[PDB]
Amino acid sequence: SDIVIVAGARTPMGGFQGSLAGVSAVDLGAVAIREAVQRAGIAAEDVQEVIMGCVLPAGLKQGPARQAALAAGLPAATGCTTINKLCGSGMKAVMLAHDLLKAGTNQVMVAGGMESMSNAPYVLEKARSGLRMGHGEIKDHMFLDGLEDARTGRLMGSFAQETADKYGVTREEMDAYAIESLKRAQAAIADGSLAAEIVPVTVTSRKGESVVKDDEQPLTANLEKIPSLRPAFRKDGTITAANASSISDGASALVLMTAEEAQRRGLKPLARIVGHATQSQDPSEFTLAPIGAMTNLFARTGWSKDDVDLFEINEAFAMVTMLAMREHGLDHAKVNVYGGACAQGHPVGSTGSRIILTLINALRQKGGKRGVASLCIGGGEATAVALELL
Amino acid sequence: SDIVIVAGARTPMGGFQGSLAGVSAVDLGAVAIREAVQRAGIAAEDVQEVIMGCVLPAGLKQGPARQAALAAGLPAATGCTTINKLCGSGMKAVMLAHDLLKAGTNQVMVAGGMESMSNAPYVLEKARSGLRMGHGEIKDHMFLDGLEDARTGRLMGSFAQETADKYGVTREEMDAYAIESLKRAQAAIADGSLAAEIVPVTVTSRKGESVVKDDEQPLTANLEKIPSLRPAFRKDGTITAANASSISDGASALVLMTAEEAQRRGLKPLARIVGHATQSQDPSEFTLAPIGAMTNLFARTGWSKDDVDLFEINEAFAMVTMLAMREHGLDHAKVNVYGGACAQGHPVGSTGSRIILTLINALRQKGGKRGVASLCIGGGEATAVALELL
Amino acid sequence: SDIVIVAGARTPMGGFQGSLAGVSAVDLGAVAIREAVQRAGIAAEDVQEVIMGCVLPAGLKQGPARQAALAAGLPAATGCTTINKLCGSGMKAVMLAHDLLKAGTNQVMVAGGMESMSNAPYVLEKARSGLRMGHGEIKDHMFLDGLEDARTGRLMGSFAQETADKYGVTREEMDAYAIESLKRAQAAIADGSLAAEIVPVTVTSGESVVKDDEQPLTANLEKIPSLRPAFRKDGTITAANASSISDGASALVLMTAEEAQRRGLKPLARIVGHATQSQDPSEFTLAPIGAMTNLFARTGWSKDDVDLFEINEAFAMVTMLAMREHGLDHAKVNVYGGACAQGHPVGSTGSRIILTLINALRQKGGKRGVASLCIGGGEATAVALELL
Amino acid sequence: SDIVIVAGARTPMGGFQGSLAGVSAVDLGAVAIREAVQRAGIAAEDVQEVIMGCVLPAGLKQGPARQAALAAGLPAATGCTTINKLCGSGMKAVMLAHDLLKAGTNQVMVAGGMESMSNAPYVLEKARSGLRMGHGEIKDHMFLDGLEDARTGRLMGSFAQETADKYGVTREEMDAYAIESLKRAQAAIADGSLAAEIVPVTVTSRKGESVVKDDEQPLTANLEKIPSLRPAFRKDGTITAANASSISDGASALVLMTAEEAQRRGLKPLARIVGHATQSQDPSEFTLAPIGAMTNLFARTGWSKDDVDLFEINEAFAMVTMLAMREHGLDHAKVNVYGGACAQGHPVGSTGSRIILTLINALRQKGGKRGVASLCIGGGEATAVALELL
């Protein structure tokens, strides 16, 4: 059973306590789902199972993906599951779906991601039992259960820093990358090349109500300020907020069906999924997992870099994409052509699925075909997806 | 591809803030993954993917499943995912493993779940942005994200209370069900009926290091109190501690394979997955979802209630199993033979893959072949799974 | 011995999360205590004991008075006590100062009070023992130990809304008083009538100097009839006629008259007497009336000998009911404004008004002044001072 | 004007989370004031002003002293104030009462103090504005505002340990001191000595009513453990729990008058206050501050050490009383005749007044006319009262 991506939608990527702060992650998951369905040509009735990535579901209340579904308009007959594969949660949702559909368990499914890092709460670890005496920690849940390694408590960035140096990556080369990302993720917000993949967002507030249709981080940045930005993860450090992905808010969804189920509803799906692959190695090498994730996909699928037109390779850290580009021998003109998250943002739970939609939607406006999205995973993993335009 | 369970393991269930409280959920997941992969007569290296349920990941640190697997001794070359299908994550985890094994992504998988309700933290919702002025809230993570309806903010036990009344389930009727679960629960401890499936878990007291091997509630549970306990969800309600499931810490792991992977490796699997099904409906009517689940199971399999030797139906509340039994016309003596969650405890992330495994235990020990396992899920859902001994 | 106020100084009074939010209460107290000393015209060493009002001592660390004394440049040998009789803190510090200086225990004292209401933290009450199971409250310290009655957890503007109503005080009456206040306040700033009592603060974020109270620069006169209530949906009390929440500090160098002379100092005022009034916590808005009644019974005065009163504007209505029941002239009360318009950093104000009263009495010509403010738990104090 | 103490009473001192963790600071002062006034021969009305020391008010409510004054049965006309001179607050309040009486301001006053370090809250300093990002602290209000010096954040202990090394006091010397303290406490608890000064306290819990009428530490203390105890404050230090004042709850209250006011109502008072002294030095030298206090006292009063029949030198640590006894040449046979803080306990707000009581009680039961009571005050300070029976 050949699996196909019928429709796809995703929210703007609102930066930390920025545009979409007054929206709950769930509410952002709806906007993505609700519009992924409408763009498909199906009804809500006719969705069997949802799978949503969600890394920080503290304070999201019971069954985060259940809520996102009911709000998106879906019936209570529809089954839902929240998953956490950290920064791959969104691309793991698509792969769980893709396999369930190969195994005849459903014929129509949605598979997106969702994060409001802004309203990720705070946590008290000993307050249940009693702190008894002495001061104590109160932990950033975004940080504690998201950005910092379980063993070392070191920031995903701290590791990027170590790995970077070790492979030779100078302030200047890492600034070359993060500088073009700001122009590309402004060249597309200009040529309006992202309005297609995106669905704007009606936000409340004291200052009346407002529409949000554009990626927040790039329009509130400075491209000249870059080679003076203080280091972010080590006093004498090469990594800064320019070349490190942003803390941001958003969601995204895809409708997935079998070839037949789509050829039987006379729907014309955007793309077909050719294969997926998981890379897994040591937490400290999370920044490099992408190399082997593709090296596995290129393996299972029979493809090479050369037979690929575009790649969406998440910029958790400019060096991730760089070293992945370096190691696999990828021309920079064929990688994140509308720019990566070091310009746009990275709502950890959502990106996996966004970059699939963005990839898809680039193969379209660039009249390309064969594509590969990969992202890195805190805990030392990558997930690689490979699809084809229809 | 006929899909086989090959071996399985499940920790003792400890009461809220008792015998398994020192140990984390990551750490109970490890004990259980280890002792499963071993009993299967395979090596760590041989495990390709892991799928671990977990409803309460606040305070668990990055990738709760990644830490479970690593700590167990699985090499980092082994993919790790955390899912949340509320109280059904265990069963879903198995159900996903199932379809992925079918699909062809993997031949060897570990799937299961882990939870320490005792070490669920607390959350401040506005500590990040600022409480400006006036009193604020501090939220029990277990209740806010695990144990109460998203929409209304009402506890599972409250929705259960309303439906007990509506279906006219009397104080007396429910106790009798529970006065039986505990009798069955102590009998298995007494005569070692659950030894096959339990790994013991080694803990630190102030007296040095002791082993826990038995479930906690069956021991700390006084049978001649059940008629005089107070109601739990309504001042004058029917549902008490005794006929509601206890809040528990535990984990459980199963080793799944294609039948021709067990064959190739010269192994004797325990049982076969014949089929699975889901049911979804109004989040207020979740206790009535297992009935549909099993109906959906019977349809997808071709099984009837007569072709079924033994049943596992998770006793979230005595009324859940009582009502699935009434409608399906099931025979008490062939349903939760060794007792359920009302006597033995309910580690929410875990109880979905543990029951799969008590079933495989009872079927072999009581001399059955065909078994059905199912449980209700908050959000208005349930999962069912059907299996046959080899 | 008669008691002189040698000199004084008080900070600007910033808003809630406003201009002196970047300064702790201990640091404001400091600014106030240092500039008081300098003015008295004596050495930090000459001061023998420091008493400060502090309502909200959570997270100011050990002995808040003590820290302030030290940071103000007073030596380690300088006695330090920190006290709380709520909003009357500042003025009780000056009444404990009076009684010490009367009884031979000292000669040179500093008294006043300090309050960052902005940086008042939040508290948890069960987290030491353990929360165990079920949700919990995170209480504001401001509200729990300052603004909400003990027995009834009811705010003070709630009790004052209730009093206004029984004593029949309309939105109109009140919004009027509030308008005259904000004018007299806005007037004093342009005129510089408060430059003498005030000591500027240098906040560092670069760095800038706060010199004028902050509320009266950001309070529209126009919109007073258009403010929504604050304590009950069908309310007559608003942001305009109820005191606003304020950073600020105030200190005051008291001597025995003998030590004043014996140092060649020319002091500002003499403390002729003082009184406390204590009654039912619901009737806190009415305690000033008793306060001043006892103060007259003691001093031997009548409202006649008073040239100017400072009866704190805790709520517009507290002054408006004292003004009724004592027969006081709005023209002879809170001349440069009051709490409603300027601010009310709760610990500080008790002393501040003693200081403003003295700056006015001078600039406006006048000998005899009276200070009174209302206190939760059902109390008030009054001071009776005379210029020299 | 001559000042007299007409009566007092004092709660038994509770241990930290011990046998008065279920009464507030306020209800303890309440129990104290009431019995004080009862023993005084007077009517609650006749009390004109109330001064109560309390170091840890956070969470106690508005006007801790007021609350207590009322709950004792003192009318609303009897006005109230709360003061804070750290560990000598309770003495300070008596000194202010003495001065106020002297000056003409009242006729009958009540001075005392109250602490419940048990029921002291935890604080979040950065909540109101917001934590924005990264982990925070939750700060013990007993440590922050009570037991750690402002400048350094070091514990009173840490200063006491560093002082004890410099002035060369050996662990074995402080343990000999501690050992005679506790034997004195135990002899005192059992022979009934403290009963004339103690007022029993009535509580609830599960079972129903309890009467606490005995200091808790002397009854839970094991003489033998003294020299085996770990070092409390430095890695390989000399200061242990047995020779540090215990964290405790309690309260005390004295009924003071001028001499003529007590005769006018025809009452035989217990003792005349003769003088008080205040010492103040750098915060690291707080430990030695009682020496200045009794120096300045001797200086004001006219008195010398051979005039003083008994001392109450509160033992914040064994090494205060010891360095204090060394310097003024005192005999532990004449100082803390019934034990002190190390054995019984240290309710910071209360000890100051309490020990004025024990001193008196002691001088009546052991024959003796002249007394001195001093205690060291966090922040480099110390107060001291001298008093004469009548």
Ligand SMILES: CC(C)(COP(=O)(O)OP(=O)(O)OC[C@H]1O[C@@H](n2cnc3c(N)ncnc32)[C@H](O)[C@@H]1OP(=O)(O)O)[C@@H](O)C(=O)NCCC(=O)NCCS
């Ligand atoms: C890098 C990090 C520490 C920076 O946090 P921050 O302090 O909030 O940074 P901000 O971007 O908000 O502000 C810093 C400056 O960078 C600038 N900036 C940010 N992105 C920029 C870009 N692409 N180009 C140019 N300037 C940029 C901002 O405009 C701002 O300028 P200013 O300080 O002069 O006003 C933070 O984003 C982080 O923790 N990174 C998350 C990555 C991570 O670990 N997780 C990814 C999962 S693998």
Ligand SMILES: CC(C)(COP(=O)(O)OP(=O)(O)OC[C@H]1O[C@@H](n2cnc3c(N)ncnc32)[C@H](O)[C@@H]1OP(=O)(O)O)[C@@H](O)C(=O)NCCC(=O)NCCS
């Ligand atoms: C019902 C509930 C509130 C009871 O917890 P509790 O009263 O706080 O704690 P306990 O269970 O210790 O107290 C109940 C009492 O009954 C006893 N008890 C528990 N199970 C018993 C049994 N099977 N037989 C007899 N006695 C039993 C306890 O041991 C205890 O005895 P005690 O009162 O003398 O101490 C709690 O179990 C709960 O909320 N359950 C959650 C159910 C849930 O949400 N699960 C998910 C469903 S999808």
Ligand SMILES: CC(C)(COP(=O)(O)OP(=O)(O)OC[C@H]1O[C@@H](n2cnc3c(N)ncnc32)[C@H](O)[C@@H]1OP(=O)(O)O)[C@@H](O)C(=O)NCCC(=O)NCCS
């Ligand atoms: C806090 C309190 C002042 C209410 O204010 P708030 O809700 O925080 O709001 P603000 O202080 O911003 O006031 C609201 C508006 O009225 C304005 N305002 C307040 N006082 C004003 C005055 N005297 N004249 C004109 N405008 C005024 C503010 O500037 C603001 O204008 P804006 O909304 O257009 O910006 C009031 O509830 C209060 O006093 N609480 C504490 C109780 C107390 O004082 N107790 C101690 C006395 S015993």
Ligand SMILES: CC(C)(COP(=O)(O)OP(=O)(O)OC[C@H]1O[C@@H](n2cnc3c(N)ncnc32)[C@H](O)[C@@H]1OP(=O)(O)O)[C@@H](O)C(=O)NCCC(=O)NCCS
């Ligand atoms: C040092 C301190 C923090 C230790 O806390 P702690 O160790 O939790 O206190 P504990 O009472 O549990 O002491 C540990 C042991 O010492 C024992 N102990 C304490 N005082 C004892 C005594 N007088 N005789 C015998 N044993 C004693 C306890 O019984 C306990 O034994 P256990 O292990 O069987 O329970 C505490 O005693 C203390 O009071 N410190 C602060 C001092 C203070 O009040 N500061 C203000 C002074 S200016």
